[PDB]
């Protein structure tokens, strides 16, 4: 329903989030995925590292500069998982992929924007308790991505600023809640109560 949906990547399963986002894009919807480094995969860490190394074996033998390109950043791992779910070699598939933006951390302007979750791809609601899982940032750092500490630093800073913002907003909603409760017994308030409001 929104013009652009900014999906918080944290706690989501790579394949299930990728499928959801791909069908969203093919339907004309603009999706942004932020915090791609806290995205999740099912299975123990070593198993997914082994699957990535299996991907990382593939390379054009005679000229490795034209083989599969193994992009290491968690945004690009998610993007690869998503590009396989779209006919990206067509103009329709290319057009749909260009309704997608994926980032590590939360850069501007999306830090001031509402983040959503996709429950059918959330690890909490999907993956049975006790089953091992892999956080994508660990996997990317393990297989080459060299900006985990940077994103962690900037995310700590962003969390500090956002905590200040939320403290202010909670103070203001305390004031507004007091005001609406002080008017909660007037004639017009009771009339709105009769109408489910």
């Amino acid at each position: 329903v929104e013009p652009v949906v900014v999906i918080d990547g944290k706690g989501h399963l790579v394949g299930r989030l990728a499928s959801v986002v791909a069908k969203q894009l093919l339907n004309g919807q603009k999706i942004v995925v932020v915090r791609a480094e806290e995205l999740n995969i099912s299975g123990e860490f070593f198993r997914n590292k082994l699957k990535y190394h299996d991907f990382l074996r593939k390379a054009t033998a005679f000229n490795k500069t034209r083989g599969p390109f193994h992009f290491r950043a968690p945004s690009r791992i998610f993007y690869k998982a998503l590009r396989g779910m779209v006919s990206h070699k067509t103009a329709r598939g290319k057009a749909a992929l260009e309704r997608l933006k994926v980032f590590e951390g939360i850069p501007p302007p999306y830090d001031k924007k509402k983040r959503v979750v996709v429950p059918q791809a959330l690890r909490v609601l999907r993956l049975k308790p006790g089953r091992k899982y892999t956080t994508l940032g660990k996997l990317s750092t393990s297989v080459g991505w060299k900006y985990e500490d940077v994103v962690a630093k900037l995310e700590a800073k962003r969390k500090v600023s956002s905590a200040e913002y939320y403290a202010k907003k909670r103070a203001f909603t305390k004031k507004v809640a007091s005001a609406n409760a002080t008017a909660a017994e007037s004639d017009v308030a009771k009339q709105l109560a009769a109408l489910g409001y």
Partner: peptide, 8 residues
């Protein structure tokens, strides 16, 4: 037209 796959 098929270019509108994704059009409102």
């Amino acid at each position: 037209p098929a270019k509108t796959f994704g059009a409102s």
